[model samples]
Target chain A: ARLQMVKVLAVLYDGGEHAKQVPGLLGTTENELGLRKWLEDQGHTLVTTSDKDREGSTFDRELEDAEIIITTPFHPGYLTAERLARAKKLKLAVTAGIGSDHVDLDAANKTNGGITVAEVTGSNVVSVAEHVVMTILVLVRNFVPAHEQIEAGRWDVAEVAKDEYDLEGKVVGTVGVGRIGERVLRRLKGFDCKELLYYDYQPLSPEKEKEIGCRRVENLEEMLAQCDVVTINCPLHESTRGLFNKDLISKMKRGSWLVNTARGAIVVKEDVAEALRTGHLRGYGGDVWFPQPAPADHVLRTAKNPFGGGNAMVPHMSGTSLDAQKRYAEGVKRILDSYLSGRFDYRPEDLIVHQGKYATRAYGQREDVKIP
Target chain B: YTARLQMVKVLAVLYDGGEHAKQVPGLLGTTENELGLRKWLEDQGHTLVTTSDKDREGSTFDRELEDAEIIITTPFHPGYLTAERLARAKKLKLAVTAGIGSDHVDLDAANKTNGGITVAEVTGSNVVSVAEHVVMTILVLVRNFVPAHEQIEAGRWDVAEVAKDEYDLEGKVVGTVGVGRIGERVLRRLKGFDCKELLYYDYQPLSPEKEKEIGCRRVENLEEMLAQCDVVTINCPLHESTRGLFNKDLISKMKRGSWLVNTARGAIVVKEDVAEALRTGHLRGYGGDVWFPQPAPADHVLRTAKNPFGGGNAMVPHMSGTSLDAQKRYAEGVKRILDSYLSGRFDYRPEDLIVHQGKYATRAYGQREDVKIPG
Candidate 1:
């Protein structure tokens, strides 16, 4: 019996969390799809782990020998600088979903001799766009408070009516008018709002702006001042963390609403809670909390204004819906196929960092370590 | 009951006097538009006055109050007939409300004076239209949609800001103040949302079988029901007992963080209290098409009394009765009633006929003259 040489070690979280449709990386906890035999026959060992805790864990033991580490944004195996430094044989890192901030890009680049990092981009744009719209309406309409009142068995028309209003003739703006932002504007056209505004580093074409009935603001501050509702759609990076601070929030129209489906770290949690408390910002709602699986005592988990309302935050689940999981899983497979077949030319858009160099695109700039 | 066709004069007082009134005569086909009724009545031919002016001193009501045999008005701009005004209307034989809710007419006074017949607004004409509007308003308010739009206009991106106030409508309980034709239809449509419960408070209890069919329950008292409802929708008529029923005292009894929808009438709820509750965060949202004064003043408190930024208020113009589909049905019903009255063959539904034989029938109509004929 010949022992086939394992070329790729696809280390992923418990795949049962997602649908059991596609062949996922095989391990004790991974989905028992047909992929296990197929991959093994094709000469590869798939290592799955539910243990992400890097301190003296089975995953840490496996991290030393695995050449390719595959994980999901949902149940991420946080590849910290220490873990990445220890993975001597690691050559590549892949994200089953978007957002690779969980992995230490600096350590991967330096220790693994410039390991490549890629993700399934644009796979969950529509899923997230729909969620963004859902969150916007829910926050603006004071829906939670009203719904809670109903469940509590109280009929106070005046109590609920106080904060209710029609969405027609109101303004909504977005930050980073990208794929999700554009879709948000397209769906909102039927509502007949007053206007739609957006801000991005690179402005969209005039024709595209006209098509969506949106105006792009070159200055993010100008966009902030004019929007009654502001949604963040940009990727997270060094320049974006703490982007919405006290100084920036003070510029927003008093009592305006905010929604972010982007990375949670893009906003400073403490500042947001403060703004909500002082009523400078009316409400805040989103599903992405900084640090996945936020601790129960996370500042945002229980943060609310004095009114015990104006907070629609939830678990970090904007991108992990049943529909989204299918898309991301397929995307993950595509990335793997390219890598294994040596036909692994990355989608330029999906390449966040590759070959010891940062991709020269928006949010591609990194400073955690100097890539030699 | 056939009154001599001897040329009966009719007066139509409407708010927008331009087009709708011009077309009304096409239905009658032969009525004369006598601008000044004083001269026309003196000359022996019956006179008709058409004026947009509805004020007491305006000739539209003053001249027509005396000799007009039939007066037609719409709910958009009603011609109020108080007890004093009805006393002056000596020859006024009929007072017609072109649309629903004829609370503007003193039915008691109309019954006592000249056995004047007060007829209104009957049938389920605007039931679907108003019910659809009610559902739309409910979604709008419960969703906290307005402030989100405002944030967009101002150009900002704070996910936590808007997400803070958002929620899903999957499990909320919705109650209707009165479950009449429109209220019942509202519950039927709301069945799709999977609301926890649907309750209604109406003077006439619906049959238990009908209640089971619509998945609703009847509340015996308004106050007890109000205290238990999360969303209190007003579908009852505006009578003395119902008018201003949702005043400060009643509004205070409502659950905190509740929603209110009233497509019935604005006067039913105290407008000022509604604004105050919205300001204080007592109520989550308020929406309706009815206003005490149609074309409510721009400075009307509720018009601007939004939650914090613009959280709760779905106020819109009185266009529920003007939906294209509703217009067709109501216009036809109005013509049928007019034709019946003119031909002395007015076999109106008992509920539809508010006044007959120059007097009011329903106790809700107040005072009336009991006329006895040869029989």
Candidate 2:
């Protein structure tokens, strides 16, 4: 009377302590049941374990035969070429959120008849956009220093007012004019800034540009040279990672603030810390760290300027708002549905790779690794 | 040939009640020994009254209010002129508020009683200073700065404790209640935040070209505009229509987590309602340097108000107009107003002169005195 159901095991990292944790699928350890109930209701066996990252952890042993692997950008379980080579049952690797750089794409494509890798796209635009604005003001107004002054039980007005200036007249420019970048420009319209500029490979529609009072620049170098505040909004791809190195930062306006809510790998951590130290860059604030769950000793985390206040680093949370989480959870289900029905037809916009070939031109080839 | 001038009498009613108020007579071309009225009035053939009292119920302030020709009050220690007091003060020719906002004096009463004209320290005033302060308050609330500072004070290193309440000013819709002299300056300064949009609610719309220049639009209805803004700054004068304007019913229409910065006047907001809103997290943050009564009681609702994490209070003394640079300007302006009134050539700006020729220029200043309140 009942039809047979196909089993899909989702090996994902622990979801941390979120208020509305997702349910369903197989987890490697007891602590990994972020989504166990939902899968069980569908008559699916859900195995959750927190034994990930251990040499002899149950997660590593279970991963050998799992049909589907799901992980977040935060606590990435790096699936390397060596592991993929032995993963005979692996068919799909789903990134619950954006940024799948943690998974080795070349290795996944070559092994297991080119395993598919996908992520929930456009899920964190609003979350990241809001973070961009918050970081910009936090640095521009020199908020941390003034705040520190108040806590130190001092009334030194001169010290607090030293670097304070209104955000009303500065020139703000974004590195890439994508979904998040465009939204950042739109939000800036009300601030009445002097100018809004963007450097992108492709320009947006003229009507949209006019509505948001923005101008496009083809050259990234020129945009950085003039921007008093620069926000990096591009994805972490081969051409973008380590893009904001020392040489590129040198071109920025003197004492300008830099914000990157994208991926931490896009910026050279040491170069940014040094820039802030030398007062070459007035301030640096972002949520992304090079390595997910960055060690306490991460350079940017403790980096302070010579005068002692230009770093606005926070834990990786720009794209984890309550609203953004809902969008990604729903997107994950849609991706799962396409895979289970055997249709396997992915949304073009959501597809990062298909049939063992790059679906987009954004992340060019990486010389460090060989392509399948 | 010109004749020698006679000694002028001045009545200074400031409440710093410190060395500064004591130094007033020296600047007024008089000495401390000659400061008290009775003996000095007889010797110089003039009258003078130097007292700090300002209540209506039979005090030194009331005694001086009866016949003093020239009266001086600071925004710190306001001199409220009710209709009853105005009817009795027939000889009162001038009233000066040493600082900005002269809503204390009943303009209507001043005009009808003695043809009295009310002039405040208008020149070298702190329009820029106040405008900058308004912007600072806006950021303080929008960014949740005060509470974050408090966390550090409590020796807590919980970043989430502070970060959970923090927000960005970008992409947010901001509106100003008024767009007059100071409002225009505020809009000019706000150009840097990259806010989503800016709107203003003013009786008179700025010219189309001017509006376009500042990149702001005019909202015709105040209530309709409130729902759209994530941040609202009040820049209008306090009056019958504006007093208690931000009450509970009106605040209920605002976006749940919106911020409010009121550097205009304390009376504009209902203090109890604002505190309740902050307690319940209905209003994200509230900041200003104003109180209905200056030197507000230590237990004023705003003083003790806190958000979920003990943040959201950005209260300060009425120091928006007391910046060193601003003080220099208003001090000079006060002297000019006094000079203009004494020389009988007080060519006051039409808008600045609250009462002129036995009539209130604006409804804000109702039927007050018709006497010559000094320039």
Candidate 3:
């Protein structure tokens, strides 16, 4: 079969002992989820490597003639507009995880009559949602520094208590109420927070909103001003880039906290550091950071507020929890089955761009472009 | 009220008041600041000396503790009334805890001092505060959050390194040692996490119906319960029966790498035993807001007790139950107790009275003969 001969390159993060040890675990390592065995069994080619660090590396040389590409948002072999132009036969780009942002969506729309962009969506909503709640708690409770105090051999209760607070009776809002954001609200319900707010252009069904005990706020600044904690869980797109910059951050309650697990670029690093430094934000907690594998000199790395400010920063592993990895790896196999079986009927929700146009409204709609 | 007036001294030993708490209305520990008791006392020709200096060679409390007729102390910052100190207080009448639990005072010693100086505390005032802290610590330890934050600050993003050890609270077995008000509340909060099962062990067993309602079961034996739980929280009152309860032997009975949370009391667990358990990874984590010695010196074993990967151990100052909101409740409770005392009514709540009229008012402190330090 002509389809069986396709060259598929999977660029996933290297998993150490945790990689293939979880029995059926995949989506990391050179032979993830038995993709190599199945693909090679049918006369296809598979190349998996963590060596996608620069512009003209092994990733570039391999992509020159690769027909299908698979990469993860965590350690991507970035398919930028320039890189897409060099791929002579590329027709498909799959994100082994939930994010397809690593592949330039616009470039995928035009390259080789559209590189079908799809991801294992919904495979990590629970994992990321749980992380958002944890980050919120860690920041509001001044948890990290208190824990630091312990490991440092200190027992200054007054020092830790001066800033620690209960999440109860505090206002919390989500910037984008999609899959993960909605789940975060559900988890927070038991904490007995004062009010739950979400800001999205499209309102959720009234019944669904009531079920989650969340109300939609029409204006961003209006939500920012009221919430004691603001969490970000929106998709990265042109509209969302640098959304939490200086102007919008200025509108937040002076001592409110901010958490972002969606995408690092959704918040400006400089603005976030400044807000945390000046006490505009009581704390800043999140896993995602811009240009992830966040450089050592990043400003948010050491930013602190007056009272040893609230910072619960961690590496971007929120969506890659072990449970989520299993599901997403299974998802990657399912997506592969659709494309390899000569049936282009991919799950509609999983597609970011298909047949040369935006497939999901998660990214901005391009009215001027003509679709296949 | 005028007939009961006296030129007696009221010495209160509390946690140090910094600039932030110095003026907060609810922060009664700033005994010199505004509120019910300070104003009411000094106006009635009484002396109110509030000092946070408890354990020092020449602290004000060392000098004044002998003659104070009324002593107000907090579990957050206790004067630690041992037999020697209680014997010196010739004028001491009532020893009151502004918050819950008088574990700091030797109830046995207080029973024979000054015609059995009454020992009381504000009961149930900060149960919710402490309960919330228990849940937070459970999540904190299980999630392996502290180490993740450290990795980020060190300018590393090794997701595998951190995510390998981190876990979700869902489906983990968690049990509370004493399921009274705080423990029961903790089970209610844990319900939302989708935990596998909740267990509790206490001298007085919870009713079968009550246990079913909370989706928790009563464990007949503490050792059996320890073996089953991935997380064990201490919520029982500290007494001669419970002091040093979680020693090396009991900790060994616990599941390896399980978490232990204590907001109940510090002395209930052997300090060195817990720190060593953490050091060897026999316990995954230990977190609490209490310590055997308040202002636990810099060398407290738990302070630097971490595994090779630098995880486990989330100790903090005894502040979990002393949130600003909780401080308000106990402060109000303190005034009510003071009002009854100044009015010569002495109508303290039955549960708040640990000792009254030269007798042990409650069984919170077990019989002195039962005090056996477990190794």
Chain B TM-scores per candidate, in order, are 0.85, 0.85, 0.93
Question: Reference contacts recovered by each candidate, as fractions?
Answer: 0.00, 0.02, 0.42
- For model 2, the stretches where C-alpha displacement exceeds 4 angstroms are A1-38, A45-62, A74-88, A146-158, A297-299, A302-309, A364-372, B1-235, B239-267, B270-273, B280-284, B287-305, B309-375
Candidate 3, B173-242: lDDT as tens digits? 9999888878888887777677889999887667888788779988888999999999999998888779
For candidate 2, give the docking quality class from DockQ: incorrect
User: For model 2, how many clashes?
Assistant: 43
lDDT of 1 at A295: 51
Candidate 3: where are CA atoms >4 Å away?
A16-27, A30-34, A364-372, B1-5, B18-36, B57-59, B204-214, B358-375
C-alpha TM-scores of all predictions? 0.53, 0.66, 0.91
Best to worst by DockQ, what's the order? 3, 2, 1
- Shift of residue A11 alpha carbon in model 3, Å: 1.7
The DockQ figures for the candidates are 0.03, 0.06, 0.43
Error of 2 at A172 (Å): 1.2
Cα deviation of B44 in candidate 3 (Å)?
2.7
* Residue lDDT tens for model 3, A199-281: 98756789988887889999989999999999998889888998899999999998899999899899998999888888889
Number of the predicted model whose TM-score against the real structure is largest: 3
lDDT winner, 2 or 3: 3
Listed for every candidate in order, the interface RMSD values in angstroms are: 14.2, 8.5, 2.4
